[PDB]
Amino acid sequence: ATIGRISTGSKSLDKLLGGGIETQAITEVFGEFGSGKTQLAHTLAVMVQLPPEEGGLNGSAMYIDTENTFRPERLREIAQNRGLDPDEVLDNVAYARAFNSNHQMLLVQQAEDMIKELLNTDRPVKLLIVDSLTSHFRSEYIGRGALAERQQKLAKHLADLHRLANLYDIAVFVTNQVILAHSATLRVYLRKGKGGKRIARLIDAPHLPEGEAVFSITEKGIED
Ligand SMILES: COc1ccc([C@H](C)NC(=O)[C@@H]2C[C@@H](O)CN2C(=O)CNC(=O)c2ccc3cc(F)ccc3n2)c(Cl)c1
Ligand SMILES: [Ca+2]
């Protein structure tokens, strides 16, 4: 099946990504707090709902929150400033707080039920966001010998997410706070730069060209 691409709102970042965030893939963004990772997660939740000539997939979003950083009014602001009805945009986001890593795994199973349900409608799920994906795994699996256990449990959770992405043609977007193995399709490092900008760099992506993207956090979410 054709790979769909969701615009980030930034032409610079979209170019770095090869056109946007891909369906049939897990894109991981990582960086320090305020680096743009979570602002990008909120922006994509709006952008996916747009028609393709506007950078979206005529889809809906699902958002797993692990550290209570989801802000519905921020989604409403981004939507309103892009010409969209804020409440209709918020209605196209399914939201869940993951209480712990085991609950996070169950939420991925439940996401499959909603994905299946909406698959052949005019607005299928096209984006599944997991914000600070590793937070509960780092809090719970700690101490002597915890590296192997944590990495196996994360590898399984990521394999579950890859299957949803591939089986249902959705984009899976995950964020993480800054030698460990990783299994996302594409990893993007974000940092603050000068002039209030954020800088993006692809990590271990020989398949994508050399460069860094520059973007701003605005009332439209993310843009150049
Ligand atoms: C202040 O106004 C609001 C208005 C809306 C929201 C969010 C966007 N919408 C909601 O919370 C809706 C309102 C009700 O219809 C239940 N609901 C779910 O989204 C319920 N979610 C689920 O049942 C559910 C299962 C499994 C899930 C699995 C996932 F991976 C991700 C999300 C998942 N979400 C917020 Cl945070 C604030
Ligand atoms: Ca952020």
Numbering used by the authors: 108 to 285, 304 to 349
Show me the paper's own sentences about this structure.
More detailed exploration of the SAR around 6 led to the discovery of CAM833 with a 6-fluoro substituent on the quinoline and a 2-chloro group on the phenyl leading to a further increase in affinity. CAM833 has a Kd against the ChimRAD51 protein of 355 nM (n = 8) as measured by FP and 366 nM by ITC. The lipophilicity associated with these groups was balanced by the introduction of a trans-4-hydroxyl substituent on the proline ring serving to maintain solubility (clogP of CAM833 is 2.73, and tPSA 120 Å2). In this new binding mode, a shift of the backbone of CAM833 allows the NH of the right-hand benzyl amide to form a hydrogen bond to Val200189 (subscript number refers to the equivalent human RAD51 residue, which differs from the surrogate protein residue numbering) via a bridging water-molecule rather than directly to the protein backbone. We attribute this to the truncation of the His residue back to a Gly, a change that can be tracked in the X-ray structures of intermediates from the optimization bound to HumRadA22F (data not shown). The phenyl ring of CAM833 sits flat on the protein surface with the ortho-chlorine atom sitting in a groove leading from this surface with both making beneficial hydrophobic interactions. The quinoline more completely fills the Phe pocket and the 6-fluoro substituent binds into a hydrophobic sub-pocket which has opened up due to minor movements in the residues lining the pocket. Using structure determination by X-ray crystallography, we show that CAM833 engages with two hydrophobic pockets on the surface of RAD51 that normally accommodate conserved hydrophobic side chains from the BRC repeats of BRCA2, thereby directly competing with the RAD51:BRCA2 interaction. Using dynamic light scattering, we observe a shift of the average particle size from ~40 nm for oligomeric RAD51 to ~5 nm particles (corresponding closely to the size of a RAD51 monomer) in the presence of excess of CAM833.
BRCA2 acts during HDR to control the recombination enzyme, RAD51, a eukaryal protein evolutionarily conserved as RecA in eubacteria, and RADA in archaea. RAD51 executes the DNA strand exchange reactions that lead to HDR by assembling, in a sequential and highly regulated manner, as helical nucleoprotein filaments on single-stranded (ss) or double-stranded (ds) DNA substrates. Structure-based approaches to identify modulators of the BRCA2–RAD51 interaction have been impeded by the lack of a monomeric unliganded form of HsRAD51. We have previously described the development of molecular surrogate systems for RAD51 based on an archaeal ortholog, RadA from Pyrococcus furiosus (Moschetti et al., 2016). In brief, we were able to produce the C-terminal ATPase domain of RadA as a stable monomeric protein, and by careful mutagenesis, to convert the surface of the protein to resemble human RAD51, with the ability to bind the BRCA2 BRC4 repeat with high affinity.
